[PDB]
Design a binder for this molecule. Structure first.
Ligand SMILES: NS(=O)(=O)c1nnc(-c2ccccc2Cl)s1
Ligand SMILES: [Zn+2]
Length: 257
């Protein structure tokens, strides 16, 4: 089974998921001098005032915060998108050291971690149908750098002890993801894929230019999670990121200059 270790990590994924060597894989390095400013691009419209979080889960490769997506509560529109995309979950990728952990890079710089807010296009009716479409998903990517604490993130940090191992879940209601956004919503966008198996090429990536900062203590607590299940040999949940993939025949567009 796939993972991030030496014997089952990203370099092995292609043997069970040949789309891993596909033409629109993610993540990629954003070359800021090669990105094209596109003034046709609209501002992002993030409407999270009615988000309903439900649960937080350790799924064995990351932890997920899940939302009720049975109606248009928390939605993303605008930017390069056509239609309404509903939030279904968010998760992070992070490193064992502060100098690595993000999946996207900016002029080959790595950040300490990367936040993914996953949304699906309501025109396809449910999430499983949306991953089958080239415009099915929109993922908002936010970089984390280590600096001052992010107060909005502490509620998440404090519950991690209760979901330390794979398969553990905890009620997680009334969390407002607005607390995780940077001040500016300027972005880069490109067509890409899920960054874990099954690696489907169904994602319109929206990566925010401005990182958010979190303390060292906050990311420290991320690194205390376990990839393993309870009762199993302890394997710390670190470096759950996929390295940059070739851009191929793609253009990254910028919403700003
Ligand atoms: N890292 S990510 O946001 O591109 C992502 N990759 N895989 C994802 C996924 C895979 C299977 C089921 C649900 C999801 Cl949300 S979400
Ligand atoms: Zn992700």
């Amino acid at each position: 089974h796939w993972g991030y270790g030496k014997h089952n990590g990203p370099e092995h994924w292609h043997k069970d998921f040949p789309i891993a060597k596909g033409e629109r894989q993610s993540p990629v390095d954003i070359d800021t001098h090669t990105a094209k400013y596109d003034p046709s691009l609209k501002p992002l419209s993030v409407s999270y005032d009615q988000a309903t979080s439900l649960r937080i889960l350790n799924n064995g490769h990351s932890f997920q915060v899940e939302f009720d997506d049975s109606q248009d509560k928390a939605v993303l529109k605008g930017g390069p998108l056509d239609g309404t995309y509903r939030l279904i979950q968010f998760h992070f990728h992070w490193g064992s050291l502060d100098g690595q952990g993000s999946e996207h890079t900016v002029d080959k710089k790595k950040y300490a971690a990367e936040l993914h807010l996953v949304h699906w296009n309501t025109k396809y009716g449910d999430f499983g149908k949306a991953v089958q479409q080239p415009d099915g998903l929109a993922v908002l990517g936010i970089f984390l750098k280590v600096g001052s604490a992010k107060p909005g993130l502490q509620k998440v940090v404090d519950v991690l002890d209760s979901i330390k191992t794979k398969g553990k879940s905890a009620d997680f209601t009334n969390f407002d993801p607005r607390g995780l956004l940077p001040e500016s919503l300027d972005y880069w966008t490109y067509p890409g894929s899920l960054t874990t198996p099954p690696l489907l090429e169904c994602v319109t990536w929206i990566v925010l230019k401005e990182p958010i900062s979190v303390s060292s203590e906050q990311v420290l607590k991320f690194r205390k999670l376990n990839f393993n299940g309870e009762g199993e040999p302890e394997e710390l949940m670190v470096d759950n990121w996929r390295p940059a993939q070739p851009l191929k025949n793609r253009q990254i567009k910028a919403s700003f200059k």
